[PDB]
Amino acid sequence: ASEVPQVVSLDPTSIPIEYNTPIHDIKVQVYDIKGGCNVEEGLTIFLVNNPGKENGPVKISSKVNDKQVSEFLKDENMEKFNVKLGTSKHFYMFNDNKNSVAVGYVGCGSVADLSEADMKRVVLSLVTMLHDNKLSKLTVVFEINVDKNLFRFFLETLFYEYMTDERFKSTDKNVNMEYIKHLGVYINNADTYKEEVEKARVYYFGTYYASQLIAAPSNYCNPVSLSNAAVELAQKLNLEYKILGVKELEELKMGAYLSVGKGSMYPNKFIHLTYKSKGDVKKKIALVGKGITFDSGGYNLKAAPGSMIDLMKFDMSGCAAVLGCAYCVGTLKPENVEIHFLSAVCENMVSKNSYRPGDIITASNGKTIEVGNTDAEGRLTLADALVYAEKLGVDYIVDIATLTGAMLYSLGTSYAGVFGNNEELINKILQSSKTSNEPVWWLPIINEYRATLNSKYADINQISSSVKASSIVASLFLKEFVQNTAWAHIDIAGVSWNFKARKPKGFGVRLLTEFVLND
């Protein structure tokens, strides 16, 4: 652990992190629907659809073990309500023991198989029922068909959206915010879904941990404090760790990564965590996250309208996903694998000491690079991280990065893009996207654009002379720093931030963990 430099004594010296969240105190119980539902304290919510009948009526099919509640939920009373996706109603009544109970439903539409986006809308409606209501228990009755992965995603998303991050509130903490202590779930074939519960709780926290790092502003979350947080995480999980400082980075000749950080008051810190299975290692994987804790753009300052310099604390979202994956992997302990979690962390600032547009810098593999724009800093840091990763001798290198704003014009805010030099690895990532329910789309590395990276003076240009397809150009540049290892690159610039809710998504934690686990 290194000391965080301060300008004034009021500058923070660590990222506040909540490990023991209220979600972790919730006791989860799963019951089979065949035994009927007991309707007692708290709120009991039925998830109901009506296939093929758009905005069709609500009908409750499950057996309910209360005559009063069964009478309330008969078809004649329920048919006045409809299943329109995201719609909900609350019910009040006295049960057979003369206790008042609260019941309701969330509409799940008319399409038998819900997409991750549909299921998220269902969860958001459920969370509105949890907020502003002091409940000790929620019970959820599944009258829809979900596979095991989608059941886990429901739980992960519920936990994540319910959790409210108050680390930076002082005088404006929500004085009414209370969390349930119990969650009941009724589902058909419950025994087959029970193994998903604790996996969902792990995936939730890896994702929420990533969100905590992302949302932490750049005065709290800087290269020293972020690498310190990684050390503490490794200590908690018994992972091996190494933080490389400037002197070691100079010895490794990491000139592209070091140049980006020249202008910052925070020394560069390179994170290397390692998980190794106890048994024979059958696969070795390097996960590389882009870790720019604030991106001002440098001398190519983000001053253009719409460049959103105020959100650029999120430019370490890739590092956060890799560290959240380390939480999940260190918790779940997969066998037969060795995983390296890597991030070349730095901050891109304006200073007398900053690198300049036009500088020619030398990466750790000897390639000279002409810098065309100091705001294309992520690919420079990743170049040196990829050289480092390939020296580890791994089977797969996967990097994840908020690399190019063009991602918003190609895939938008819902799907990440994956690029790579190896179809088998790309297909493994796409399969992990399916089982994590974090959507990714394969995009091409178009070799015809490579000539636009030819530099008159250096071995290569950082940016293209003509091509505006920057996500593809960036991938061509990165490809030059992986010589003979299967490699894939996930550009999460469009999917990292939830603009409607003004908070991170923690995108990539579950994708990467499913990738490690399914291998």
Next chain:
Amino acid sequence: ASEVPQVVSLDPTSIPIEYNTPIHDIKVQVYDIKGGCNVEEGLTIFLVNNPGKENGPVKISSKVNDKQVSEFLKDENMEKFNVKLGTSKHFYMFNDNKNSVAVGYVGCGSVADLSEADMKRVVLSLVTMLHDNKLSKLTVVFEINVDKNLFRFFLETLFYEYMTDERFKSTDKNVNMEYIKHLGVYINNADTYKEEVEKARVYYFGTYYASQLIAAPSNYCNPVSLSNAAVELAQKLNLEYKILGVKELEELKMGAYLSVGKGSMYPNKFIHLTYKSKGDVKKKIALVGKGITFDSGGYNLKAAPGSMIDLMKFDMSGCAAVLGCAYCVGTLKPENVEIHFLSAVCENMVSKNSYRPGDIITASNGKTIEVGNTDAEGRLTLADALVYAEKLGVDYIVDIATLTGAMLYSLGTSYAGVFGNNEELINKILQSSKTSNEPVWWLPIINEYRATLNSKYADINQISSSVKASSIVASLFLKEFVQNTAWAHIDIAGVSWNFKARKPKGFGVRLLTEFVLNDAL
């Protein structure tokens, strides 16, 4: 001379410079064309035109001392080819010694007298024939008429365009790059052209030396490393030299120049080299180059669309031209002159320490200046350099500077602009432009605009309140720092960088050298 400060240990501490270039290893021989051409080895190229005939046929006039090549070059076999400017052809054949030779031509058009731009196109086509062909020797046969200056220009341009700067390549060096070892030239009245060969070689390196400094990026070429390179050049040439550091600049009260450099991690360095002739000194000249090794714009940051911040390593092109001229002058050693080569070198950066828009700063002649835009920094450094130059007691002061982007809208990328306070000196610059074949156009210093530099609080404003003709306004500002000396100002902002080829031109080395040489004779 001074230690280059570093942020990380990987930051470079000197500019790589190649002094012996492959061009210098080319042995050049000039033969009179009257004796006929020998065609034995390598590539032999005829420079051919057809005066008055639009796109007329190739017709070879020279005698060729080989029966086989003469048969190939007969009019009947050449009439399928035309002399269109820049067109070229290659021929393969066996000579009388049964050795395979390569022969060809480059078309020089139908207009007997070629401009500098025309000759450049001819040379560029020649260079394409040298690339991707591993040849030991090139022979050029002039079947066009060129004067001595244009023959020298041909060689200088050939040398400059042929040379490839690989200083910053490591893993991507051209594995196939081979240079000729011999250059043969056949020309009429060869004895009068032989003296141009070594002059062309000197002018080539002065221009290529300037290009090397310009193309070197701002992490390599900073105020300390550039002034160190100037000392090393002065030492090799036996020039007197002095580098003024911050404490001496403070004692000289160089407050405009020092303000520009406040925001940089590199201390300001003022270059002063001197060439002095052995005999009676009849003329004393100060050459002043703008030397901003990187121009971020300062707090008036180059953030507007079209502001090319990524190219601003070229903002010391004027300094580079002056040092390239020092090489040529120190090598050719003219008589009757003393030449001072000056540059107020610094870097324009954004920092807690930078000067601010609105600051009022005091120049070394006591004039107070209101800073209106920190990106108008060149005229500030030049103001103090001009005060220094006039204190030397010279006959002429000439400054050269990448000063105003408006130059691209006035003269464009081919012609530099010259402004000045003295008609005789302006005419001497124009004559040097003609004999150097570096084009310059005289532009006016329009005194009506001077009132727009009136400041409410300081003695003068740095920038105009209303006038958009910024090349003229900048000249008017500079004019305030020359009190009673003949002075001219050459704005090379539009001509310094070759946008098509993505490389410097080294513009001004030959212009300034011709200026010195013509005034010395």
Next chain:
Amino acid sequence: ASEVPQVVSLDPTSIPIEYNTPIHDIKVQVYDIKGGCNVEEGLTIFLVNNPGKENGPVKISSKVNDKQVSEFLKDENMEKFNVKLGTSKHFYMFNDNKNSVAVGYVGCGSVADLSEADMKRVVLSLVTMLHDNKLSKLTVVFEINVDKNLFRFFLETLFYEYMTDERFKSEYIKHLGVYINNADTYKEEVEKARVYYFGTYYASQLIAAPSNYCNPVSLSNAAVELAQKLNLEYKILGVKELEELKMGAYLSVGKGSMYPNKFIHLTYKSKGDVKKKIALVGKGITFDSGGYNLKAAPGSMIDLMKFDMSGCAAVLGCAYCVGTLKPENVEIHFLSAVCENMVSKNSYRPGDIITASNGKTIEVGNTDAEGRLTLADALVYAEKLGVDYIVDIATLTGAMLYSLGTSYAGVFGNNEELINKILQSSKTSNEPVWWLPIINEYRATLNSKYADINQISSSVKASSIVASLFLKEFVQNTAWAHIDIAGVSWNFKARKPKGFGVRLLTEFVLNDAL
């Protein structure tokens, strides 16, 4: 005369023109300073400098034949005032006859020879006193040195700046006295100055007239009226004739306007043998919206674009001076392809390929580069006349503001002798111009993939030079010059036209052409 189309009945159908101005009623007398200055009525202003002593004191050299005013003008009183250029004071007092007179000075700085810009500043300070005092007479005493041309420029500028254009709103002195050393040599400049003033003011009236008043129909109608008043030959070519002449570049620009294109051709021809023939071509865009390349960028000044016919205006003001002064042995053609560049379903588009009257196909790269298209067909028309010189004058390129600015126009040409004649006309008219090059290396950037030539360059930012290269393609074998007045036409500080070019072109015709 053609009928001006209207959208509503309130749209104007002619340009109001004032021919008889109050300036024409001023009686001018020039007296030699030797013998002393009489100070009897009105306002008397001394033009005074102080060479070497910058902002030095005012000192009056002339004898004044009034004892009271002489006391006022004593060195001890005048040294409280200084000669900083444009500074002025004037006081009211009783002269020896107990008549109220006003006496004062305008500072002329510390340089002995005033430039045209310095003299404008002097005149502006003089006019400020004329606008703020009810006066029957002004007397100006020259204690500075002016040559004959600068003296005439002084009078022209005084008349022009003093005149106030009130045509769109809903007392002048009657006498001007001038005391100057060697007065007899200056007397012939007075009525020349009055002619040059009105030609310049006439051009100013056409320029300042808004585009609803001054459109292609009403401007060509005004040109006919001028020709009739001056006994010039005249011809207005309409769309049917323009189509028969195949002027496809000019007609394309006007396609989107509600006003039909009108080509003005006036002719002055000397009574004696014609020894020199000259065509003067003025750009006449009565409003330049930019077309589909609309003037929407910050700083594109769409609200000022009524001035895009300033070249035509100068050519017509020149026709006034020439028809009035009647030079011998010359025939002069005054030409303008007048139209309006508008946005409509009917406009030409960026990318259109159009065919000029000499058969050249042109690829339109920007509809706001419309002036060179109209000038292209005008130059083909001019060369068919068989003239010795073609001079065009045009508000062509905004790049002039970045090259020479608002004070000097640029001249380009294909013939050095003709360029030097224009520069000499600039010296004697005191309308400054600077010679700029036509750089042949840029010509390749006008090579079009599909048409014979591009209208604009894709790569070269030296737009004034590229525009000249384009125009040169439409002059085959005639001495030709092109004067770009885009930067000098409008006086931004005073919010009015300059009428730039009228006097320059007249001096060229009178003195330098033949």
